[PDB]
Design an enzyme around this catalytic site. Structure first.
Site, mmCIF file in Angstrom:
data_model
loop_
_atom_site.group_PDB
_atom_site.id
_atom_site.type_symbol
_atom_site.label_atom_id
_atom_site.label_comp_id
_atom_site.label_asym_id
_atom_site.label_seq_id
_atom_site.Cartn_x
_atom_site.Cartn_y
_atom_site.Cartn_z
ATOM 1 N N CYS A 163 40.597 36.919 42.807
ATOM 2 C CA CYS A 163 41.425 37.046 43.996
ATOM 3 C C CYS A 163 42.800 36.852 43.412
ATOM 4 C CB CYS A 163 41.046 36.008 45.085
ATOM 5 S SG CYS A 163 40.674 34.354 44.418
ATOM 6 N N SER A 164 43.822 36.054 43.850
ATOM 7 C CA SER A 164 45.147 35.906 43.200
ATOM 8 C C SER A 164 44.925 35.143 41.902
ATOM 9 C CB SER A 164 46.156 35.125 44.133
ATOM 10 O OG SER A 164 47.421 35.396 43.612
ATOM 11 N N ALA A 165 44.211 33.988 41.949
ATOM 12 C CA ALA A 165 44.091 33.146 40.740
ATOM 13 C C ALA A 165 42.772 33.393 40.003
ATOM 14 C CB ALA A 165 44.179 31.571 41.112
ATOM 15 N N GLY A 166 41.797 33.911 40.749
ATOM 16 C CA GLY A 166 40.481 34.198 40.168
ATOM 17 C C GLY A 166 39.607 32.935 39.993
ATOM 18 N N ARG B 24 38.005 32.013 45.968
ATOM 19 C CA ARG B 24 37.063 33.006 46.542
ATOM 20 C C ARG B 24 36.089 33.572 45.538
ATOM 21 N NH1 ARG B 24 42.025 36.024 49.970
ATOM 22 N NH2 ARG B 24 42.954 34.033 50.578
ATOM 23 N N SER B 25 36.576 33.861 44.328
ATOM 24 C CA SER B 25 35.740 34.391 43.271
ATOM 25 C C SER B 25 34.614 33.390 42.939
ATOM 26 C CB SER B 25 36.585 34.705 42.001
ATOM 27 O OG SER B 25 37.639 35.659 42.309
ATOM 28 N N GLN C 92 38.156 25.911 45.193
ATOM 29 C CA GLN C 92 39.465 25.269 45.037
ATOM 30 C C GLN C 92 39.643 24.217 46.099
ATOM 31 O OE1 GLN C 92 42.065 29.019 45.039
ATOM 32 N NE2 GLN C 92 43.408 27.652 43.811
ATOM 33 N N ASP D 139 44.206 34.283 55.761
ATOM 34 C CA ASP D 139 45.294 33.700 54.948
ATOM 35 C C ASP D 139 45.109 32.217 54.696
ATOM 36 O OD1 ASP D 139 48.440 35.497 55.668
ATOM 37 O OD2 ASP D 139 46.588 36.203 54.809
#
Length: 280
Positions: free
Chosen positions: A214-217, A220-221, A261, A180
């Site tokens: 991932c949530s925002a892309g 992690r992406s 990020q 998380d």
């Protein structure tokens, strides 16, 4: 190597400064389509938008908009679509995109819930007998099988275009242990997961681009594609030590904003490339 750069940045404690310099150099391109009033509910985050020049267009006369960008890596001969986690109302668009772009794989780098909040819609079926129909884009999706491992789950899904009755198999590669907060302590599991995706054919030129989110892309992406691309270039170049992660990251940033990020994500990408090179 980039290993001496890594070790130096660590000793200097200069990750934040290196990262900030990347952010300062990053490309800036318009995202007019993303910002149109009719598209407000197609974007999860006001500050995460695809550039017009690289955005994926839905093949639909009404609204061709989805928050997704094509990242095309010319030298590495790799392409990736990075997108946000589908929203309650963009699951039909998401699978419409997978169908039209001829993707073989989806790489999901988040859990549906993290930190007690929903990070994306439950956009794929959890039981084989309970398929999903997306009425707006005329697609049926069925879970064919599921293989749960300790760090990732792979699913086979069958996507049917209901207009033509054509059927394709889509592999869903779901990395389930990204913490998380922060980044993984070791890149071992993430690398293993990247090799599992490669092994499936999902990243290969015989298929459309893999869809990564991932949530925002972008976070992690970005890490996933940055690591993949740098490792490929190290295998293909006459001089592997010429591969410059910062330069590859800025090239990727020409296609989608904000990839990687945090400075800790930057450090982690370096660690992943370094350990992955030592494995290859």
């Amino acid at each position: 190597e980039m290993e001496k750069e890594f070790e130096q940045i660590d000793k200097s404690g200069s990750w934040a400064a290196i990262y900030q310099d990347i952010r300062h150099e990053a490309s800036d391109f318009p995202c007019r389509v993303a910002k149109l009033p009719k598209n407000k509910n197609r974007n999860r985050y006001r500050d995460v938008s695809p550039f017009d020049h690289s955005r994926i267009k839905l093949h639909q006369e009404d609204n061709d908009y989805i928050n997704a960008s094509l990242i095309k890596m010319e030298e590495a001969q790799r392409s990736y679509i990075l997108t946000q986690g589908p929203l309650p109302n963009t699951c039909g668009h998401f699978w419409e995109m997978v169908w039209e772009q001829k993707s073989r794989g989806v790489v999901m780098l988040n859990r549906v819930m993290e930190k007690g909040s929903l990070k994306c819609a439950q956009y794929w079926p959890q039981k084989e007998e309970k398929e999903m129909i997306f009425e707006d884009t005329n697609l049926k999706l069925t879970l064919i099988s599921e293989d749960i491992k300790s760090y990732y789950t792979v699913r086979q899904l069958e996507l049917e275009n209901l207009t033509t009755q054509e059927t394709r198999e889509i592999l869903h590669f779901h990395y389930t242990t990204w913490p998380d907060f922060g980044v993984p302590e070791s890149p071992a599991s993430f690398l293993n997961f990247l090799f599992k995706v490669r092994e499936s054919g999902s990243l290969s030129p015989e298929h459309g681009p893999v869809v990564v989110h991932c949530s925002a892309g972008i976070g992690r992406s970005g890490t996933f594609c940055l690591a993949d691309t740098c490792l490929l270039l190290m295998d293909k170049r006459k001089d592997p030590s010429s591969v410059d992660i910062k330069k590859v990251l800025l090239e990727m940033r020409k296609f989608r904003m904000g990839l990687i990020q945090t400075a800790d994500q930057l450090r982690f990408s370096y660690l992943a490339v370094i350990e992955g090179a030592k494995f290859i």
